[PDB]
Amino acid sequence: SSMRGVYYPDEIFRSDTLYLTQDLFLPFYSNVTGFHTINHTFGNPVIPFKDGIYFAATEKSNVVRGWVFGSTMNNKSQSVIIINNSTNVVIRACNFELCDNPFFAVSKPMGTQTHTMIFDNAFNCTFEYISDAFSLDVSEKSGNFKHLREFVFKNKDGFLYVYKGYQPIDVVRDLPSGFNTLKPIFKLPLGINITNFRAILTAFSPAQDIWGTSAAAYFVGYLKPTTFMLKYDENGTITDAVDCSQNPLAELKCSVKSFEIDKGIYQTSNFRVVPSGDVVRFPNITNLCPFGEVFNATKFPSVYAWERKKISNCVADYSVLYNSTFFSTFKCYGVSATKLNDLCFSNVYADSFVVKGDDVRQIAPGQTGVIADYNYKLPDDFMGCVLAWNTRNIDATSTGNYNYKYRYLRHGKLRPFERDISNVPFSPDGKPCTPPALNCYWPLNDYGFYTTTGIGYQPYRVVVLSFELLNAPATVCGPKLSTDLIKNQCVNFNFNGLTGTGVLTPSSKRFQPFQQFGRDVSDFTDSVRDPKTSEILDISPCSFGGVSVITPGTNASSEVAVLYQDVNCTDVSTAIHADQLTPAWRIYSTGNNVFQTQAGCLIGAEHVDTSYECDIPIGAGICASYHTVSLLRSTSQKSIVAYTMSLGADSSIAYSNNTIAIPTNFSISITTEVMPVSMAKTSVDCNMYICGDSTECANLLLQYGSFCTQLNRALSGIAAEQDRNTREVFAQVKQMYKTPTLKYFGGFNFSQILPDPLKPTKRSFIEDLLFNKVTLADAGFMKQYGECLGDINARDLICAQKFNGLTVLPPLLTDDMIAAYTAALVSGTATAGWTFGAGAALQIPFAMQMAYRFNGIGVTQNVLYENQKQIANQFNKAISQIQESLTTTSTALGKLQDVVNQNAQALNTLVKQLSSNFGAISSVLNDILSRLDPPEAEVQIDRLITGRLQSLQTYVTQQLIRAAEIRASANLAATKMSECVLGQSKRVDFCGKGYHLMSFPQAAPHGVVFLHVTYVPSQERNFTTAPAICHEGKAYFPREGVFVFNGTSWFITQRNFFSPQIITTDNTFVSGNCDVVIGIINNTVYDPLQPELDS
Amino acid sequence: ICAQKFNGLTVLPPLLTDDMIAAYTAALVSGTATAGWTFGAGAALQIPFAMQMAYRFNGIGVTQNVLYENQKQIANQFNKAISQIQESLTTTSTALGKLQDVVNQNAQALNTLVKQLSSNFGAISSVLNDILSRLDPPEAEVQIDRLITGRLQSLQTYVTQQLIRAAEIRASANLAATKMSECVLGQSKRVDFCG
Amino acid sequence: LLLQYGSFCTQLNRALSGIAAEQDRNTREVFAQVKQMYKTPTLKYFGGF
Amino acid sequence: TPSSKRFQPFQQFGRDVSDFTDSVRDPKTSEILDISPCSFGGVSVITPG
Ligand SMILES: *[C@@H]1O[C@H](CO)[C@@H](O)[C@H](O)[C@H]1NC(C)=O
Ligand SMILES: *[C@@H]1O[C@H](CO)[C@@H](O)[C@H](O)[C@H]1NC(C)=O
Ligand SMILES: *[C@@H]1O[C@H](CO)[C@@H](O)[C@H](O)[C@H]1NC(C)=O
Ligand SMILES: *[C@@H]1O[C@H](CO)[C@@H](O)[C@H](O)[C@H]1NC(C)=O
Ligand SMILES: *[C@@H]1O[C@H](CO)[C@@H](O)[C@H](O)[C@H]1NC(C)=O
Ligand SMILES: *[C@@H]1O[C@H](CO)[C@@H](O)[C@H](O)[C@H]1NC(C)=O
Ligand SMILES: *[C@@H]1O[C@H](CO)[C@@H](O)[C@H](O)[C@H]1NC(C)=O
Ligand SMILES: *[C@@H]1O[C@H](CO)[C@@H](O)[C@H](O)[C@H]1NC(C)=O
Ligand SMILES: *[C@@H]1O[C@H](CO)[C@@H](O)[C@H](O)[C@H]1NC(C)=O
Ligand SMILES: *[C@@H]1O[C@H](CO)[C@@H](O)[C@H](O)[C@H]1NC(C)=O
Ligand SMILES: *[C@@H]1O[C@H](CO)[C@@H](O)[C@H](O)[C@H]1NC(C)=O
Ligand SMILES: *[C@@H]1O[C@H](CO)[C@@H](O)[C@H](O)[C@H]1NC(C)=O
Ligand SMILES: *[C@@H]1O[C@H](CO)[C@@H](O)[C@H](O)[C@H]1NC(C)=O
Ligand SMILES: *[C@@H]1O[C@H](CO)[C@@H](O)[C@H](O)[C@H]1NC(C)=O
Ligand SMILES: *[C@@H]1O[C@H](CO)[C@@H](O)[C@H](O)[C@H]1NC(C)=O
Ligand SMILES: *[C@@H]1O[C@H](CO)[C@@H](O)[C@H](O)[C@H]1NC(C)=O
């Protein structure tokens, strides 16, 4: 059950793109419940709806005649019902009864069950709807069960969204894997709380007699919040999709925004081990609150004696007091007594006294009147609570205890707590209130009656307490639990309020008796004393690191291996140790065969002992590749392997005390070198980029001062310099030499590297390959497999960007002007050699110019003229192999392609940061200016302006760095132009490789390419040799070259090319005597004069 | 390197280990001792080391016989001067200043990025658990926005420093790779370029 | 809260990954210029040197 | 402007690759219009001394 159930996410849709989005999609390869349904295996069972469902059925005649959705679908509350009349869909919102197989199928008069609506039977029809032909569209296709009706139902924001598609079927009870996309049909506003549903067969048993047909098949699968990448075509159609959760390859190609991936290692996500448990530790129990005084005095205070306090820095036993069977009543006005058992506060205020049983009615926090107002009533502003217990048995007396008097009225004491406590004739609001004279009065009844009085009289001792809540330190709390300790696992933990997540370990970390926990050199905490055991624990973080995917090209294989960076494989997954296959959907996006490296834990690759060159790099000398490994596995004999890299081919120079190796033959070579020279010249209208023509944003921007001019000054410097770079590399020629008619000098064929006038455009044939094989921002093209041609996007628009305040500007020299400078340099080089790089250009025959370039590398001139046929044939062949190479693959042009790709990523990141929220209510200025008043809109806009302006400073700073990095390559290229092309550099490996003969420049987009011509000696003899020779009395030494032995005879030769010559007075010089030199051999030096004296 | 791998910061291994680097230096020296310049341009062609030296003497414009007639003095001065390099490198710490500086600058940048975690940025604390326990959410988010903006400005600062320092090391690596091809594989005549 | 600022924690990782890959390019371009691994000679002493 | 956007019967308007709005279905009578920004740019002044 897979690749079903994708729908167009909304109505805003658009052409030819990869769009990555989050929604309640059906995740790929989840198990759908197939209700295979047949006669006795039969019913319409109610099913939970959850977050929404993919639903499908094998169908034609609308056998699934409808659906019912709601909380209950039968009683009290409204329900949505959807029914196929024989033509059309019916919708109602009514609270239907549906006690059985649902057959309340009564319908309106105009085409009953056929056109006008059905299920009329209920009591709250707040919505009703008639469709057109939405049951005939099912009935259109040929034969029942030979088609699948396919739907998504999702409920959010008070809307039921309905999407559908309808497709052919071959198996009457299966759900095929064929990809198709559902269209939206409805966004029903009905607001119903759907949590359950059922399909409707409405007592049907179809005349489509496959089984007698109290039977069908239908399918339910739950939607889940998942990230899909959706691929649109040029008609705005979804054509493909990727569930980014499924496996590490799906995650990779979502992260890369592509459906195809090249061979490489890619970073995709962070691994971060979750905690297994929780550890809470607190000290030995101590500092119990002094409640025994307030609560457990043997005889309590009278109403007027009223013992009272406030208490702090203590642990409250209130859980016990609440758990106590004693108290006749207790009430909290504040937060519930059930939580005061464990809650924390800055302090408590507490007091105690007595009442005749009746007056407990008035004493509470939240309660006031002339009883409590004139002997104890507290302010109702604390977390106040009140408790009562038996005075009737203890501190009562049978007369009524005349010491435990009644409340002492004093109407004028309006203030809380003061609420006249006092034993005084004081009852009025303001009369003189001495002792007993006729001005003033005292209620003086007895409260404390004994337990044999009626249950009204029966008096209570009473306590009130009042907890105080502040941001200040909570000096009172209920008791707190300590857990078991959990060593050697990632856990949550808490000491005395030092909370974290980590791995707790036993430790050797000695520290002083007064110290509770250790910091480290970073000043993060790393060790703690256990408050109960006094164990010295050491804390380290739970394992985390980058996750990287190792892949061949997806072109070649969809197998992948995964590297968890830096971690020990012991911490990594509860795996199943197959090579090749990650059980990834369930197991850690990964889940299989394991290997350890210093880079971290490597999964799914096989370790191989045979070394190879490094294909995909990993670290610490480990590399990976896609390789044949076991012929027993059929084509899957190719798997990902990991190995220690080979440094190079092993070799053994046979060092000899008296042997020298000298070349007998040579090979000409042509080597490409590719260099970047300039970036895309860019500018940004910062006031449009920030504000989008919001006038109010344009006002607020001015407060920041120079920035919008400063950034444009900086980019104008970078932009001007791209023309300086391009000018300094190419404009080294003094004069524009005309390209000659004859393209062929002394057998050497230039016709592929000069322009051709007979066949426009006006570039060399090799420049046409080079201008083809590069991708601009998304215009142009290049691919490493060799499977691409023609621009991937609009060229005069680069791909997009020219509409967001961003702009890109033309170069000063057009590509035709660059191709005119290379045509000038090559035609000058072919007709005049080094001379135009010093004086004026001097004509010289190309064969002679080559002989003097051979002479420059220490190969004597005659070697060229005697071999000119071979040298021309090797040159002409090597030029043709450059065309074959550039035609085959663009992998040589990677440097020029990268200059574009970095600039594309720089602009696309700068554009994406426009959409970013930055802690405003919205990233859209029209929202902020419509939803709010100006004094709030200013703060919202200021957050956007600050975010956007910081985003521009980032981009221009990246471009300053990148421009400086490109300038270093423009200066190096300008140097190679002067030294390699205009001359013959002797700097080893500066121009080409081997001995340097000459070089030709060629134009390329954003760069230059050099074709270096070099001479490589390539076959060698191995000769006996001597440092000097002794003739008569004296050592003779070679003027140039080496003395070597031909097996027969001693000869002298140049050491770049074996050319054995007679040893003579001409090619040797004398020094010293025969004894001085080590290992001098004894042989004749010939004299050209002696036979002429003998004449 | 201190502890490092334990606050989101991490340091990764190089591809070539020091034991692989030390194989390439041994290959380059033993090529230079037995085949001279030849393995740069062609394949390695074996040559007796005294004759290789006589041709390198001819390259500076001193006639070959000045070597052969003095070979004992020249070998003694060579063996002597190599031993002084070993003695000097045994004795003094100051010679490798450029390489120790590369370590020190990275150590300072990371320890600055680390200290900025403890910085307050005008919030009520630099600890998220203080903010999340002392306040209700409408206040807590604004106090966290101060820390997030502070910490994110500190990362954008650090990455910009490393981008500049990486270009400064690259300009040294390109020069060093050039001294390899010109000074080791050959006999470059550029005055005071090689020694 | 960190999601609201968009790209930056991806962008910073791409920049550090670029610098990190280049350290192997620098180290390779200096040392890996030799064509073949020439085995070190048994004799350490040549013509007196 | 009038446009060649082929966009589907349920769709109302198009976003570009950067997801700014680029085209719309006229709600009073269903033409497919395409929207481009009003002209903007740098001004530069060219001068002798
Ligand atoms: C999903 O699993 C159930 C049993 O849990 C099975 O009956 C059903 O056929 C499976 N789905 C499919 C498409 O086969
Ligand atoms: C939705 O309906 C179910 C079933 O009666 C009920 O448990 C749930 O609390 C309801 N939720 C709402 C938001 O009404
Ligand atoms: C209410 O619940 C009973 C349960 O037996 C059911 O028969 C009845 O159809 C439901 N609906 C109404 C509106 O009574
Ligand atoms: C219809 O629905 C409302 C709640 O939406 C309920 O109060 C009312 O009693 C219902 N009426 C009948 C007759 O079922
Ligand atoms: C777009 O839809 C039309 C429908 O006739 C079809 O002809 C065409 O091939 C489709 N694709 C493209 C890329 O135009
Ligand atoms: C108190 O500390 C001692 C220290 O030895 C320990 O044994 C005991 O378990 C602790 N008791 C409580 C109640 O924490
Ligand atoms: C003592 O403690 C009990 C149990 O919590 C409490 O109900 C009672 O009121 C207190 N006072 C006396 C005098 O027992
Ligand atoms: C006392 O507290 C415990 C808490 O676990 C509870 O199980 C018990 O039922 C309580 N008893 C009374 C008398 O409140
Ligand atoms: C890549 O796939 C194409 C077909 O899509 C095929 O022609 C080509 O040979 C493949 N190349 C490799 C190296 O896998
Ligand atoms: C990794 O875990 C193993 C135990 O499975 C342990 O022996 C080893 O020391 C740990 N560390 C490393 C770096 O391998
Ligand atoms: C050099 O090698 C080439 C290889 O094609 C061969 O044709 C030629 O005869 C050789 N030249 C000499 C002078 O040995
Ligand atoms: C020069 O080389 C090109 C290579 O394609 C060839 O077409 C042309 O005929 C050659 N001309 C001569 C005169 O050899
Ligand atoms: C080359 O010649 C020498 C004598 O000078 C001989 O000893 C040696 O074995 C030969 N080497 C090869 C590679 O043929
Ligand atoms: C070089 O020696 C060979 C045999 O090794 C001999 O045939 C030849 O004549 C000698 N060369 C010359 C120029 O005489
Ligand atoms: C090396 O050559 C010298 C003369 O140049 C000689 O004295 C010595 O014996 C030779 N070494 C060997 C191993 O033959
Ligand atoms: C060898 O040396 C002697 C004495 O210097 C000299 O006569 C002789 O000519 C030399 N040998 C040859 C073959 O020239």
PDB file of N, CA and C in Angstrom, chain B residues 14-15 21 23-25 30 39-42 44 49 71 75 78-79 144-145 148 156 159 162-163 170 173 177 180-181, chain C residues 1-2 5 8 12 15-16 19 22 24-27 29-35 37-38 40-41 46-49:
ATOM      1  N   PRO B  14      41.605  14.913   9.762  1.00  0.00           N
ATOM      2  CA  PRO B  14      42.021  15.126   8.380  1.00  0.00           C
ATOM      3  C   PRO B  14      41.912  13.833   7.568  1.00  0.00           C
ATOM      4  N   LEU B  15      41.871  13.924   6.238  1.00  0.00           N
ATOM      5  CA  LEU B  15      41.806  12.733   5.391  1.00  0.00           C
ATOM      6  C   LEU B  15      43.130  11.976   5.397  1.00  0.00           C
ATOM      7  N   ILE B  21      51.273  11.473   5.369  1.00  0.00           N
ATOM      8  CA  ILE B  21      52.113  12.625   5.026  1.00  0.00           C
ATOM      9  C   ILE B  21      53.591  12.233   5.068  1.00  0.00           C
ATOM     10  N   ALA B  23      54.876   9.370   4.586  1.00  0.00           N
ATOM     11  CA  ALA B  23      55.227   8.537   3.445  1.00  0.00           C
ATOM     12  C   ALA B  23      55.491   9.378   2.195  1.00  0.00           C
ATOM     13  N   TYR B  24      54.694  10.411   1.909  1.00  0.00           N
ATOM     14  CA  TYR B  24      54.987  11.294   0.781  1.00  0.00           C
ATOM     15  C   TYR B  24      56.309  12.042   0.949  1.00  0.00           C
ATOM     16  N   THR B  25      56.646  12.556   2.130  1.00  0.00           N
ATOM     17  CA  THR B  25      57.957  13.198   2.316  1.00  0.00           C
ATOM     18  C   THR B  25      59.094  12.196   2.113  1.00  0.00           C
ATOM     19  N   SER B  30      63.602  10.379  -1.234  1.00  0.00           N
ATOM     20  CA  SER B  30      64.286   9.259  -1.895  1.00  0.00           C
ATOM     21  C   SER B  30      64.275   9.356  -3.423  1.00  0.00           C
ATOM     22  N   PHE B  39      62.063  12.984 -12.071  1.00  0.00           N
ATOM     23  CA  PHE B  39      60.734  12.491 -11.698  1.00  0.00           C
ATOM     24  C   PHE B  39      59.638  13.569 -11.701  1.00  0.00           C
ATOM     25  N   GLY B  40      60.007  14.854 -11.730  1.00  0.00           N
ATOM     26  CA  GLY B  40      59.056  15.946 -11.929  1.00  0.00           C
ATOM     27  C   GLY B  40      58.556  15.983 -13.369  1.00  0.00           C
ATOM     28  N   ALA B  41      59.484  16.068 -14.323  1.00  0.00           N
ATOM     29  CA  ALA B  41      59.166  16.191 -15.742  1.00  0.00           C
ATOM     30  C   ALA B  41      58.808  14.856 -16.428  1.00  0.00           C
ATOM     31  N   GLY B  42      59.697  13.864 -16.385  1.00  0.00           N
ATOM     32  CA  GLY B  42      59.503  12.527 -16.958  1.00  0.00           C
ATOM     33  C   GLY B  42      59.059  11.503 -15.909  1.00  0.00           C
ATOM     34  N   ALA B  44      61.057   8.862 -13.043  1.00  0.00           N
ATOM     35  CA  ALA B  44      62.363   8.839 -12.391  1.00  0.00           C
ATOM     36  C   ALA B  44      63.391   8.065 -13.234  1.00  0.00           C
ATOM     37  N   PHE B  49      74.567  10.049  -7.326  1.00  0.00           N
ATOM     38  CA  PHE B  49      74.283  11.326  -6.667  1.00  0.00           C
ATOM     39  C   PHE B  49      75.373  12.390  -6.865  1.00  0.00           C
ATOM     40  N   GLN B  71      85.093  17.104  -3.791  1.00  0.00           N
ATOM     41  CA  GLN B  71      83.941  16.330  -3.322  1.00  0.00           C
ATOM     42  C   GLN B  71      84.006  15.967  -1.834  1.00  0.00           C
ATOM     43  N   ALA B  75      80.995  17.187   0.635  1.00  0.00           N
ATOM     44  CA  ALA B  75      80.271  16.224   1.448  1.00  0.00           C
ATOM     45  C   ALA B  75      80.432  16.496   2.948  1.00  0.00           C
ATOM     46  N   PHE B  78      78.214  19.528   3.779  1.00  0.00           N
ATOM     47  CA  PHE B  78      76.830  19.072   3.778  1.00  0.00           C
ATOM     48  C   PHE B  78      76.492  18.291   5.052  1.00  0.00           C
ATOM     49  N   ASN B  79      77.227  17.222   5.372  1.00  0.00           N
ATOM     50  CA  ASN B  79      76.968  16.413   6.567  1.00  0.00           C
ATOM     51  C   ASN B  79      77.006  17.260   7.849  1.00  0.00           C
ATOM     52  N   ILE B 144      13.998  35.134  25.616  1.00  0.00           N
ATOM     53  CA  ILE B 144      14.704  34.179  24.763  1.00  0.00           C
ATOM     54  C   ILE B 144      15.131  34.816  23.441  1.00  0.00           C
ATOM     55  N   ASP B 145      14.332  35.669  22.809  1.00  0.00           N
ATOM     56  CA  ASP B 145      14.731  36.357  21.577  1.00  0.00           C
ATOM     57  C   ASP B 145      16.024  37.160  21.777  1.00  0.00           C
ATOM     58  N   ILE B 148      18.734  34.295  21.793  1.00  0.00           N
ATOM     59  CA  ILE B 148      18.871  33.739  20.444  1.00  0.00           C
ATOM     60  C   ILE B 148      19.578  34.739  19.542  1.00  0.00           C
ATOM     61  N   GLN B 156      27.516  34.024  13.539  1.00  0.00           N
ATOM     62  CA  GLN B 156      27.771  34.747  12.287  1.00  0.00           C
ATOM     63  C   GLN B 156      29.103  35.496  12.337  1.00  0.00           C
ATOM     64  N   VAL B 159      31.981  32.422  12.163  1.00  0.00           N
ATOM     65  CA  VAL B 159      32.100  31.888  10.799  1.00  0.00           C
ATOM     66  C   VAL B 159      32.753  32.889   9.863  1.00  0.00           C
ATOM     67  N   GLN B 162      36.530  32.701  10.480  1.00  0.00           N
ATOM     68  CA  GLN B 162      37.102  31.502   9.876  1.00  0.00           C
ATOM     69  C   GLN B 162      37.143  31.585   8.355  1.00  0.00           C
ATOM     70  N   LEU B 163      36.149  32.165   7.682  1.00  0.00           N
ATOM     71  CA  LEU B 163      36.212  32.367   6.231  1.00  0.00           C
ATOM     72  C   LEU B 163      37.413  33.217   5.824  1.00  0.00           C
ATOM     73  N   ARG B 170      44.953  29.358   2.765  1.00  0.00           N
ATOM     74  CA  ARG B 170      45.001  28.919   1.361  1.00  0.00           C
ATOM     75  C   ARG B 170      46.095  29.634   0.584  1.00  0.00           C
ATOM     76  N   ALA B 173      49.142  27.813   1.471  1.00  0.00           N
ATOM     77  CA  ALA B 173      49.162  26.489   0.864  1.00  0.00           C
ATOM     78  C   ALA B 173      49.504  26.526  -0.628  1.00  0.00           C
ATOM     79  N   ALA B 177      52.822  24.696  -2.016  1.00  0.00           N
ATOM     80  CA  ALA B 177      52.732  23.745  -3.116  1.00  0.00           C
ATOM     81  C   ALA B 177      53.533  24.187  -4.340  1.00  0.00           C
ATOM     82  N   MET B 180      57.214  23.382  -3.524  1.00  0.00           N
ATOM     83  CA  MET B 180      57.409  21.964  -3.805  1.00  0.00           C
ATOM     84  C   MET B 180      57.820  21.737  -5.260  1.00  0.00           C
ATOM     85  N   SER B 181      57.046  22.218  -6.227  1.00  0.00           N
ATOM     86  CA  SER B 181      57.345  21.955  -7.634  1.00  0.00           C
ATOM     87  C   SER B 181      58.585  22.684  -8.132  1.00  0.00           C
TER      88      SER B 181
ATOM     89  N   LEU C   1      11.427  28.820  18.587  1.00  0.00           N
ATOM     90  CA  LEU C   1      11.706  30.225  18.305  1.00  0.00           C
ATOM     91  C   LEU C   1      12.781  30.382  17.223  1.00  0.00           C
ATOM     92  N   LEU C   2      13.816  29.540  17.232  1.00  0.00           N
ATOM     93  CA  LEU C   2      14.919  29.587  16.272  1.00  0.00           C
ATOM     94  C   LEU C   2      14.471  29.350  14.816  1.00  0.00           C
ATOM     95  N   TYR C   5      13.939  32.692  12.204  1.00  0.00           N
ATOM     96  CA  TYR C   5      15.049  33.371  11.529  1.00  0.00           C
ATOM     97  C   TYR C   5      15.479  32.647  10.238  1.00  0.00           C
ATOM     98  N   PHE C   8      19.573  30.556   8.710  1.00  0.00           N
ATOM     99  CA  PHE C   8      20.930  30.805   9.203  1.00  0.00           C
ATOM    100  C   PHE C   8      21.645  29.565   9.759  1.00  0.00           C
ATOM    101  N   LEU C  12      25.239  28.579   8.037  1.00  0.00           N
ATOM    102  CA  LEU C  12      26.480  28.517   8.812  1.00  0.00           C
ATOM    103  C   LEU C  12      27.137  27.139   8.678  1.00  0.00           C
ATOM    104  N   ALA C  15      28.864  26.847   5.208  1.00  0.00           N
ATOM    105  CA  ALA C  15      30.126  27.580   5.170  1.00  0.00           C
ATOM    106  C   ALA C  15      31.252  26.842   5.905  1.00  0.00           C
ATOM    107  N   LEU C  16      31.009  26.348   7.122  1.00  0.00           N
ATOM    108  CA  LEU C  16      32.007  25.562   7.854  1.00  0.00           C
ATOM    109  C   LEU C  16      32.340  24.244   7.147  1.00  0.00           C
ATOM    110  N   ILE C  19      34.909  25.216   4.302  1.00  0.00           N
ATOM    111  CA  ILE C  19      36.248  25.386   4.889  1.00  0.00           C
ATOM    112  C   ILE C  19      36.845  24.036   5.287  1.00  0.00           C
ATOM    113  N   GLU C  22      38.117  21.974   2.253  1.00  0.00           N
ATOM    114  CA  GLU C  22      39.284  22.592   1.635  1.00  0.00           C
ATOM    115  C   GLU C  22      40.603  22.261   2.345  1.00  0.00           C
ATOM    116  N   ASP C  24      41.670  19.374   3.292  1.00  0.00           N
ATOM    117  CA  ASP C  24      42.191  18.203   2.601  1.00  0.00           C
ATOM    118  C   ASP C  24      42.680  18.556   1.197  1.00  0.00           C
ATOM    119  N   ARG C  25      42.071  19.529   0.507  1.00  0.00           N
ATOM    120  CA  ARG C  25      42.591  20.025  -0.775  1.00  0.00           C
ATOM    121  C   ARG C  25      43.967  20.652  -0.610  1.00  0.00           C
ATOM    122  N   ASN C  26      44.144  21.562   0.344  1.00  0.00           N
ATOM    123  CA  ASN C  26      45.452  22.165   0.614  1.00  0.00           C
ATOM    124  C   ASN C  26      46.500  21.100   0.923  1.00  0.00           C
ATOM    125  N   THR C  27      46.194  20.193   1.845  1.00  0.00           N
ATOM    126  CA  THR C  27      47.153  19.177   2.278  1.00  0.00           C
ATOM    127  C   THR C  27      47.535  18.255   1.131  1.00  0.00           C
ATOM    128  N   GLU C  29      47.407  19.031  -2.275  1.00  0.00           N
ATOM    129  CA  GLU C  29      48.144  19.760  -3.313  1.00  0.00           C
ATOM    130  C   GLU C  29      49.608  20.012  -2.964  1.00  0.00           C
ATOM    131  N   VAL C  30      49.949  20.166  -1.685  1.00  0.00           N
ATOM    132  CA  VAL C  30      51.352  20.239  -1.278  1.00  0.00           C
ATOM    133  C   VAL C  30      52.037  18.893  -1.448  1.00  0.00           C
ATOM    134  N   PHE C  31      51.524  17.836  -0.818  1.00  0.00           N
ATOM    135  CA  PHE C  31      52.270  16.589  -0.659  1.00  0.00           C
ATOM    136  C   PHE C  31      52.113  15.598  -1.811  1.00  0.00           C
ATOM    137  N   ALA C  32      50.930  15.447  -2.399  1.00  0.00           N
ATOM    138  CA  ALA C  32      50.641  14.400  -3.382  1.00  0.00           C
ATOM    139  C   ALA C  32      51.107  14.734  -4.810  1.00  0.00           C
ATOM    140  N   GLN C  33      52.249  15.401  -4.960  1.00  0.00           N
ATOM    141  CA  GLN C  33      52.821  15.706  -6.275  1.00  0.00           C
ATOM    142  C   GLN C  33      53.637  14.550  -6.864  1.00  0.00           C
ATOM    143  N   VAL C  34      54.100  13.607  -6.042  1.00  0.00           N
ATOM    144  CA  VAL C  34      54.892  12.467  -6.514  1.00  0.00           C
ATOM    145  C   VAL C  34      54.038  11.485  -7.326  1.00  0.00           C
ATOM    146  N   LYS C  35      54.587  10.977  -8.433  1.00  0.00           N
ATOM    147  CA  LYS C  35      53.880  10.078  -9.364  1.00  0.00           C
ATOM    148  C   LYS C  35      53.686   8.664  -8.815  1.00  0.00           C
ATOM    149  N   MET C  37      55.071   5.834  -5.362  1.00  0.00           N
ATOM    150  CA  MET C  37      55.700   5.714  -4.057  1.00  0.00           C
ATOM    151  C   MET C  37      57.051   5.028  -4.218  1.00  0.00           C
ATOM    152  N   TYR C  38      58.120   5.797  -4.413  1.00  0.00           N
ATOM    153  CA  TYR C  38      59.470   5.242  -4.498  1.00  0.00           C
ATOM    154  C   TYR C  38      59.905   4.673  -3.149  1.00  0.00           C
ATOM    155  N   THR C  40      62.116   3.611  -0.086  1.00  0.00           N
ATOM    156  CA  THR C  40      63.315   4.234   0.500  1.00  0.00           C
ATOM    157  C   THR C  40      64.533   3.314   0.387  1.00  0.00           C
ATOM    158  N   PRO C  41      65.709   3.811  -0.028  1.00  0.00           N
ATOM    159  CA  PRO C  41      66.886   2.983  -0.278  1.00  0.00           C
ATOM    160  C   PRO C  41      67.415   2.310   0.994  1.00  0.00           C
ATOM    161  N   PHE C  46      75.558   8.395   0.202  1.00  0.00           N
ATOM    162  CA  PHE C  46      75.790   8.486  -1.242  1.00  0.00           C
ATOM    163  C   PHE C  46      76.984   9.378  -1.566  1.00  0.00           C
ATOM    164  N   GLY C  47      78.050   8.855  -2.166  1.00  0.00           N
ATOM    165  CA  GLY C  47      79.204   9.668  -2.577  1.00  0.00           C
ATOM    166  C   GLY C  47      79.825  10.530  -1.471  1.00  0.00           C
ATOM    167  N   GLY C  48      79.624  10.179  -0.198  1.00  0.00           N
ATOM    168  CA  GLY C  48      80.021  10.959   0.978  1.00  0.00           C
ATOM    169  C   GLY C  48      78.875  11.689   1.691  1.00  0.00           C
ATOM    170  N   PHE C  49      77.781  12.003   1.001  1.00  0.00           N
ATOM    171  CA  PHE C  49      76.626  12.707   1.555  1.00  0.00           C
ATOM    172  C   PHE C  49      75.768  11.761   2.399  1.00  0.00           C
TER     173      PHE C  49
END
